[PDB]
Design a protein around this ligand. Sequence first.
Ligand SMILES: *[C@@H]1O[C@H](CO)[C@@H](O)[C@H](O)[C@H]1NC(C)=O
Ligand SMILES: *[C@@H]1O[C@H](CO)[C@@H](O)[C@H](O)[C@H]1NC(C)=O
Ligand SMILES: *[C@@H]1O[C@H](CO)[C@@H](O)[C@H](O)[C@H]1NC(C)=O
Ligand SMILES: *[C@@H]1O[C@H](CO)[C@@H](O)[C@H](O)[C@H]1NC(C)=O
Ligand SMILES: *[C@@H]1O[C@H](CO)[C@@H](O)[C@H](O)[C@H]1NC(C)=O
Ligand SMILES: *[C@@H]1O[C@H](CO)[C@H](O)[C@H](O)[C@H]1NC(C)=O
Ligand SMILES: *[C@@H]1O[C@H](CO)[C@H](O)[C@H](O)[C@H]1NC(C)=O
Ligand SMILES: *[C@@H]1O[C@H](CO)[C@H](O)[C@H](O)[C@H]1NC(C)=O
Ligand SMILES: *[C@@H]1O[C@H](CO)[C@H](O)[C@H](O)[C@H]1NC(C)=O
Ligand SMILES: *[C@@H]1O[C@H](CO)[C@H](O)[C@H](O)[C@H]1NC(C)=O
Ligand SMILES: [Ca+2]
Ligand SMILES: [Ca+2]
Ligand SMILES: [Ca+2]
Ligand SMILES: [Ca+2]
Ligand SMILES: [Ca+2]
Ligand SMILES: [Ca+2]
Lengths: 129, 129, 65
Amino acid sequence: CVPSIFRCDGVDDCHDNSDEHQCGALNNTCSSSAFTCVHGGQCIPGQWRCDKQNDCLDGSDEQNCPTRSPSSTCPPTSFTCDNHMCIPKEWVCDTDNDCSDGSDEKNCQASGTCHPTQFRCPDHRCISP
Amino acid sequence: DCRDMSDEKDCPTQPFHCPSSQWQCPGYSICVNLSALCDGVFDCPNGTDESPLCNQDSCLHFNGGCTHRCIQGPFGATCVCPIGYQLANDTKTCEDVNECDIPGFCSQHCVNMRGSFRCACDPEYTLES
Amino acid sequence: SDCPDGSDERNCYYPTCDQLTCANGACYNTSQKCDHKVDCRDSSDEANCTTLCSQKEFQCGSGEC
Ligand SMILES: *[C@@H]1O[C@H](CO)[C@@H](O)[C@H](O)[C@H]1NC(C)=O
Ligand SMILES: *[C@@H]1O[C@H](CO)[C@@H](O)[C@H](O)[C@H]1NC(C)=O
Ligand SMILES: *[C@@H]1O[C@H](CO)[C@@H](O)[C@H](O)[C@H]1NC(C)=O
Ligand SMILES: *[C@@H]1O[C@H](CO)[C@@H](O)[C@H](O)[C@H]1NC(C)=O
Ligand SMILES: *[C@@H]1O[C@H](CO)[C@@H](O)[C@H](O)[C@H]1NC(C)=O
Ligand SMILES: *[C@@H]1O[C@H](CO)[C@H](O)[C@H](O)[C@H]1NC(C)=O
Ligand SMILES: *[C@@H]1O[C@H](CO)[C@H](O)[C@H](O)[C@H]1NC(C)=O
Ligand SMILES: *[C@@H]1O[C@H](CO)[C@H](O)[C@H](O)[C@H]1NC(C)=O
Ligand SMILES: *[C@@H]1O[C@H](CO)[C@H](O)[C@H](O)[C@H]1NC(C)=O
Ligand SMILES: *[C@@H]1O[C@H](CO)[C@H](O)[C@H](O)[C@H]1NC(C)=O
Ligand SMILES: [Ca+2]
Ligand SMILES: [Ca+2]
Ligand SMILES: [Ca+2]
Ligand SMILES: [Ca+2]
Ligand SMILES: [Ca+2]
Ligand SMILES: [Ca+2]
């Protein structure tokens, strides 16, 4: 016994390969700048189409995905953190620990003080004279 | 509508709805772990937790008529639904919670998956830890 | 190995047969596998035939509960 939703989702749950034996119904088009999976007929973002993790039930996203040079460093437009995580460089200094180790904020100057050309108020705010 | 949130003061409530990793006791809206069933302890309030059917081997005839797991509970054939899943009113069928249904489950795009979810942000945005 | 020194099996070779085989390397006809008669001297024919224990019990590969 398998939930009715699975009867048409492209990969047979019933090991007799009797789920999509007669359903078909591949009548719709996924939107562009996105990706439709070859079996089951679902829509997932373009990024999911070829990434280390498979997304659609058919696994057709990674069924046709190259080696993609796994030894390469992350793009230098981003920043790296102690826990081997890579995040955009803009995030390096803000109020958010964008990586669990917090190594982005660890180096920052730790001071939101106002310029001498302004006035300072107790709760993280500065106002023009 | 009544701005004091007192128009809906007597509105109905949903069932006790024990988590999928647990079991419910009839007549008292109380929850006991699945391990508690068919163990000889009288966990439920008035002895509702045990019956000698705890050995009726209902499971092997046809997986109890259930999709994921069968436990020979106090009421004979009882079924267990994994984490992230839910059990229909049909005591056998087990289905996947569409987490995306709750507004704001994730910031921008949500895609339902069997017992799981995946989320995606627009190109000018990225996703966090 | 009926003798501790093994001198029963030690000398002789073994006749070839291929219908069904027993853990000790003995052969039996196909029907013999599950008829509840002990055809293999080591009972390896009947051992795998049916579940022997209830759900309160646990089953052990030796044919034990
Ligand atoms: C269920 O089991 C867990 C893990 O053994 C335990 O922490 C928890 O207290 C149990 N809950 C109940 C209601 O028995
Ligand atoms: C059993 O039911 C009675 C009412 O019929 C209730 O008062 C009692 O507390 C119940 N037993 C337990 C252990 O809660
Ligand atoms: C229970 O099953 C009936 C059909 O027998 C269905 O109409 C109803 O929607 C189900 N209840 C809920 C809460 O889904
Ligand atoms: C297998 O069957 C033949 C007769 O068909 C019989 O002679 C032989 O002894 C049987 N083998 C065993 C191991 O009993
Ligand atoms: C016989 O049963 C035992 C226990 O299930 C198993 O370990 C063994 O592999 C089985 N042998 C055959 C030939 O099926
Ligand atoms: C199908 O998707 C395409 C893009 O892949 C267009 O959005 C088109 O308008 C869609 N048509 C239908 C009928 O869904
Ligand atoms: C791995 O992919 C790279 C390109 O990303 C090369 O095509 C390489 O030849 C591939 N090798 C294998 C074994 O797939
Ligand atoms: C980062 O990866 C590139 C290849 O894309 C080079 O291997 C480079 O040497 C790497 N940099 C570091 C510091 O390891
Ligand atoms: C506060 O910030 C000002 C500029 O807004 C300077 O960076 C200065 O170094 C800071 N002063 C203190 C007291 O932290
Ligand atoms: C909530 O409603 C359910 C029926 O859907 C039960 O009546 C339950 O007893 C109610 N719980 C509360 C606290 O009113
Ligand atoms: Ca299917
Ligand atoms: Ca993928
Ligand atoms: Ca940051
Ligand atoms: Ca119990
Ligand atoms: Ca889900
Ligand atoms: Ca036999």
